[PDB]
Structures are given as structure tokens and as C-alpha cells.
Symmetry: C2
Subunit: 125 residues, 2 copies
């Protein structure tokens, strides 16, 4: 129902400082009549339809990352946790009850992440 | 701005199964022209102005509790984390950036929890 053009970006990737390269790859992977997916790294003032949480060891050890995760789940919305480089036993327990993409999927999860984003965009006017 | 009478309870206490007694005490403590504070234990269909998270070891070891915490912070609202029976080093990292009540305060934190609730009620019509 929400207008696709009401935000400038379709998706941004929220990531810890030590996962920059990986985040960049995902951005690139997402960039490749509803047009291409407009993508960027999440920044303090980023406004996008979808937000990918690149949940890694680095992400888990930064309290601020955890806080950002909380802010992403306050909205109907589009938050896509991607679990990368972690034992499932160490996944955030909340995710036992939530949607997420396992990094052990195709293209390190990227594929499914992309699909999720596309799904969400198809619900936009 | 929101009408005080728009919800039936002013506060409910969200707690793990092994903290029932403690939760009850807090409820009792909260019960003791804006009238008495109407209080109960949180249940699946509880609707209250304020929600206290009784964050304990028991709470931390139950993934569902964690999930409830997340649901409490999706709204302006009134969510009061109370940290009880835990080393601060083991507090949920999110709380580094959020308001909470330390159980090492007066009356095991109860006092301050109560104050918070009262503050919130004073902002209601």
C-alpha cells in the first residue's frame, strides 16, 4: 500500500565495522517495470523500505549493533536478519520465533535475502 | 494525551515461570484524584498502559521471555525493565542505551519502578 517512491532506497545493510567488505558484497549483490533494487550501507540517517541485519560474530559483540537490531524491529515493515558466520546454537534466541535467513543457504544467504526484499517491494504501490 | 481509561490496567508484570512469587510481590507493591495503580501479572491478552519486564536469570534463559521483551518495545510508550538478581556485567547489552531500573536500588528496585509508572500515568488524560 505504501508508495515505493516514498523512500529513496529500497534496502540498506546494517553491519558492524569489521564486516564492511561483506556488507559491501551484499549491497553489490542486491544492486545487480519495477526497477533495479536501490541499495546502500545503512547510515545514521538512512531511510529505506527494507533493512538487512548482517548478524555476525562482530555484530553480536557490539552492544550498539544489538541496539540497532531493536530499532529495526519497531514499526507491516521489512527487517531481514541474515545469520552469517555463526553456529546456530549461538543465534539470538528471539529469532526462534522470527523470520531470518541462514547464511548456510544459497550464495551465503544473499539469494534469499534478495528474494525477501523483492517480495516486500511487490506489496508497494 | 492518551486517555487513562482507554486501558483497564495501569501496569502488568511480565515474568518467567520461576519468578511468579517475585512478580506477585511487585504486583502487590504496585497495588498499595488519580486513583490507585491497577495492576496484574501479564498474560497473553493483557492490555495495560505500562509493562514491567522482570528481568532475572530465569527470564534470560527463556528465549520466549527475550521475545516478549522485543514485543514490549514496539509502539511514547511505557516499558520498564527491572534488573533483578543479575550481575550488571550480564545485563542485556541493549540496556546500555536504554532506561532501566536496577534491582540494587531501594526496595529491590520496586520503588523506582513504581515511580516510573506514576510518571507515565501523569501524562495521561
Amino acid at each position: 500500500g505504501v508508495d515505493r517512491w516514498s523512500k529513496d532506497y529500497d534496502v540498506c545493510v546494517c553491519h558492524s565495522e569489521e564486516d564492511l567488505v561483506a556488507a559491501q558484497d551484499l549491497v553489490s549483490y542486491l544492486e545487480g517495470p519495477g526497477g533495479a533494487i536501490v541499495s546502500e550501507l545503512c547510515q545514521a540517517l538512512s531511510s529505506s523500505h527494507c533493512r538487512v541485519l548482517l548478524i555476525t560474530p562482530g555484530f553480536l559483540q557490539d552492544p550498539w549493533c544489538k541496539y540497532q537490531m531493536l530499532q529495526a524491529l519497531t514499526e507491516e515493515g521489512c527487517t531481514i536478519p541474515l545469520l552469517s558466520g555463526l553456529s546456530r546454537a549461538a543465534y539470538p534466541p528471539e529469532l526462534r520465533f522470527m523470520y531470518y535467513v541462514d547464511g548456510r543457504g544459497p550464495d551465503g544467504g544473499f539469494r534469499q535475502v534478495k528474494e525477501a526484499v523483492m517480495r516486500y517491494l511487490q506489496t508497494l504501490s
